Amino acid sequence: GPVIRVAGDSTAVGEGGRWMKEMVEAWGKKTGTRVEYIDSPADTNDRLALYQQYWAARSPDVDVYMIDVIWPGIVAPHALDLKPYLTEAELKEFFPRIVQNNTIRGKLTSLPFFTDAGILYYRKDLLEKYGYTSPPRTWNELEQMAERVMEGERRAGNRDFWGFVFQGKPYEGLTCDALEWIYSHGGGRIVEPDGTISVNNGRAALALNRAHGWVGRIAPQGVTSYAEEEARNVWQQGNSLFMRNWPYAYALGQAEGSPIRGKFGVTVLPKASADAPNAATLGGWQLMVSAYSRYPKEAVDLVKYLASYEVQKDNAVRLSRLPTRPALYTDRDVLARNPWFRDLLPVFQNAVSRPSDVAGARYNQVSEAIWTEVHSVLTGRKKGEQAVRDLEARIRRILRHHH
Ligand SMILES: OC[C@H]1O[C@H](O[C@H]2O[C@H](CO)[C@@H](O)[C@H](O)[C@H]2O)[C@H](O)[C@@H](O)[C@@H]1O
């Protein structure tokens, strides 16, 4: 019978790829359908390029793809429209914001699978040790805490200890971290939903100069090559006071044999001042049936299974990844395992989006511009003022004649 082949998630990021393969195998066993899992590189932008090889070829060699929240406007031609396959009631069980994100010129490109938002991880044992009662609310506070805790932990002999780790590598994750910096300084959304390229302003420039000021000071010099897992591994070994990362890191830090098990909490990222907005960049992944799949019916069945209540529950309980079904946020088992899902639900709902809707199919080019200009500030090549002016000019060229 048919072999249903799935490309999604990566065995190089946490347990996501292993868990995904397990879920696809469970569907295959449940339905008596052969399945195969195709692995992917860690970074989302490398995955996009890989999957674009399949799509360009109209390849039938992958039936189901796990696609990033930023991709629908790029990948729509390659997606089977799912709208005819779901009832209005089925579709209402997901967050409407994500269903809307995944709908491009009427085509339901993909079902919401898990959402994501950037959050602050903090070592509560260390905050207590050094006389702090709450995590930092402002970036200045985060810097002051990091400097004091670092000074003490270095003096006590942990030469591997840093104050803050984050994603500073030149790739899509840096666009995520930088949106949070810029937005949390009142510097805007880089490209506004209306199309205005707003990034050339002094608040955005200050945000980027501040992040430069971390590098080699409270954050490792090598932070400029960190993606999610590099940051996580310094954190998880017990070598950072603070980390910016996504929800998946929580379950991994609580696992038996983690050096930091029981020693951390999570909160919203800091912001420049009390009247700036909170920033958490919206992430997450969706499930797309290939337009080139020879087995659309079977593939839609697998996608509905993966997106179901019990598979998303399993994702929440075991991998601390955020459901796209509001009903799961009231599930007693989800909440007992992850109480912080309730505490931060409003942060998740108010997550700020990257400019993928407004840039549409040109988003990847826009983002490459952003992460390269931001990276030039982190590396000390440019000051924030020059980088936001140069970025404005690049994005203007990229989006000229796009509506
Ligand atoms: O939360 C775990 C996921 O982390 C990655 O995806 C997030 O980070 C990306 C940038 O590096 C975003 O574009 C994406 O929207 C976020 O969800 C990783 O690519 C995923 O495989 C992980 O599941």
PDB file of N, CA and C in Angstrom, residues 309 312-314 316-317 321 323 327-341:
ATOM      1  N   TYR A 309      -6.300  16.660  19.488  1.00  0.00           N
ATOM      2  CA  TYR A 309      -6.173  16.988  20.880  1.00  0.00           C
ATOM      3  C   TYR A 309      -5.161  16.144  21.597  1.00  0.00           C
ATOM      4  N   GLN A 312      -1.402  16.835  20.451  1.00  0.00           N
ATOM      5  CA  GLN A 312      -0.953  18.132  20.995  1.00  0.00           C
ATOM      6  C   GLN A 312      -0.791  18.059  22.522  1.00  0.00           C
ATOM      7  N   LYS A 313      -1.630  17.287  23.202  1.00  0.00           N
ATOM      8  CA  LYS A 313      -1.501  17.155  24.640  1.00  0.00           C
ATOM      9  C   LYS A 313      -0.174  16.509  24.958  1.00  0.00           C
ATOM     10  N   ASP A 314       0.157  15.461  24.218  1.00  0.00           N
ATOM     11  CA  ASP A 314       1.400  14.745  24.409  1.00  0.00           C
ATOM     12  C   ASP A 314       2.596  15.681  24.191  1.00  0.00           C
ATOM     13  N   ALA A 316       2.577  18.935  24.635  1.00  0.00           N
ATOM     14  CA  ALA A 316       2.604  19.808  25.764  1.00  0.00           C
ATOM     15  C   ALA A 316       3.225  19.143  27.004  1.00  0.00           C
ATOM     16  N   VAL A 317       2.717  17.958  27.321  1.00  0.00           N
ATOM     17  CA  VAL A 317       3.148  17.267  28.556  1.00  0.00           C
ATOM     18  C   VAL A 317       4.607  16.847  28.472  1.00  0.00           C
ATOM     19  N   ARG A 321       5.745  22.017  24.617  1.00  0.00           N
ATOM     20  CA  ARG A 321       5.452  22.860  23.470  1.00  0.00           C
ATOM     21  C   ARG A 321       4.023  23.297  23.460  1.00  0.00           C
ATOM     22  N   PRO A 323       0.214  24.278  22.786  1.00  0.00           N
ATOM     23  CA  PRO A 323      -0.856  23.868  21.912  1.00  0.00           C
ATOM     24  C   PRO A 323      -1.424  25.000  21.061  1.00  0.00           C
ATOM     25  N   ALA A 327      -8.601  24.803  24.166  1.00  0.00           N
ATOM     26  CA  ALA A 327      -9.060  23.839  25.168  1.00  0.00           C
ATOM     27  C   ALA A 327      -7.952  23.127  25.938  1.00  0.00           C
ATOM     28  N   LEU A 328      -6.771  22.980  25.334  1.00  0.00           N
ATOM     29  CA  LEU A 328      -5.710  22.380  26.037  1.00  0.00           C
ATOM     30  C   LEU A 328      -5.136  23.226  27.157  1.00  0.00           C
ATOM     31  N   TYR A 329      -5.322  24.549  27.088  1.00  0.00           N
ATOM     32  CA  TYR A 329      -4.799  25.410  28.148  1.00  0.00           C
ATOM     33  C   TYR A 329      -5.630  25.347  29.446  1.00  0.00           C
ATOM     34  N   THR A 330      -6.764  24.656  29.386  1.00  0.00           N
ATOM     35  CA  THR A 330      -7.587  24.375  30.582  1.00  0.00           C
ATOM     36  C   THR A 330      -7.543  22.924  30.983  1.00  0.00           C
ATOM     37  N   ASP A 331      -6.750  22.116  30.299  1.00  0.00           N
ATOM     38  CA  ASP A 331      -6.611  20.665  30.612  1.00  0.00           C
ATOM     39  C   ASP A 331      -5.803  20.460  31.860  1.00  0.00           C
ATOM     40  N   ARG A 332      -6.341  19.663  32.796  1.00  0.00           N
ATOM     41  CA  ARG A 332      -5.714  19.590  34.114  1.00  0.00           C
ATOM     42  C   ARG A 332      -4.316  18.998  34.048  1.00  0.00           C
ATOM     43  N   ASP A 333      -4.096  18.033  33.143  1.00  0.00           N
ATOM     44  CA  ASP A 333      -2.805  17.374  33.010  1.00  0.00           C
ATOM     45  C   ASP A 333      -1.752  18.297  32.345  1.00  0.00           C
ATOM     46  N   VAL A 334      -2.173  19.033  31.338  1.00  0.00           N
ATOM     47  CA  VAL A 334      -1.274  20.008  30.704  1.00  0.00           C
ATOM     48  C   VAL A 334      -0.818  21.044  31.757  1.00  0.00           C
ATOM     49  N   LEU A 335      -1.783  21.520  32.546  1.00  0.00           N
ATOM     50  CA  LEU A 335      -1.504  22.627  33.476  1.00  0.00           C
ATOM     51  C   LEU A 335      -0.737  22.132  34.694  1.00  0.00           C
ATOM     52  N   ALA A 336      -0.963  20.904  35.119  1.00  0.00           N
ATOM     53  CA  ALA A 336      -0.214  20.395  36.280  1.00  0.00           C
ATOM     54  C   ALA A 336       1.279  20.236  35.926  1.00  0.00           C
ATOM     55  N   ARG A 337       1.515  19.787  34.691  1.00  0.00           N
ATOM     56  CA  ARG A 337       2.900  19.612  34.221  1.00  0.00           C
ATOM     57  C   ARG A 337       3.556  20.921  33.918  1.00  0.00           C
ATOM     58  N   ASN A 338       2.815  21.880  33.334  1.00  0.00           N
ATOM     59  CA  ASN A 338       3.325  23.164  32.896  1.00  0.00           C
ATOM     60  C   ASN A 338       2.466  24.335  33.431  1.00  0.00           C
ATOM     61  N   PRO A 339       2.606  24.645  34.709  1.00  0.00           N
ATOM     62  CA  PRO A 339       1.726  25.683  35.312  1.00  0.00           C
ATOM     63  C   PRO A 339       1.924  27.014  34.680  1.00  0.00           C
ATOM     64  N   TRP A 340       3.146  27.247  34.207  1.00  0.00           N
ATOM     65  CA  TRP A 340       3.485  28.450  33.504  1.00  0.00           C
ATOM     66  C   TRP A 340       2.768  28.686  32.201  1.00  0.00           C
ATOM     67  N   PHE A 341       2.136  27.678  31.607  1.00  0.00           N
ATOM     68  CA  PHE A 341       1.315  27.885  30.481  1.00  0.00           C
ATOM     69  C   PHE A 341       0.165  28.830  30.850  1.00  0.00           C
TER      70      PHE A 341
END
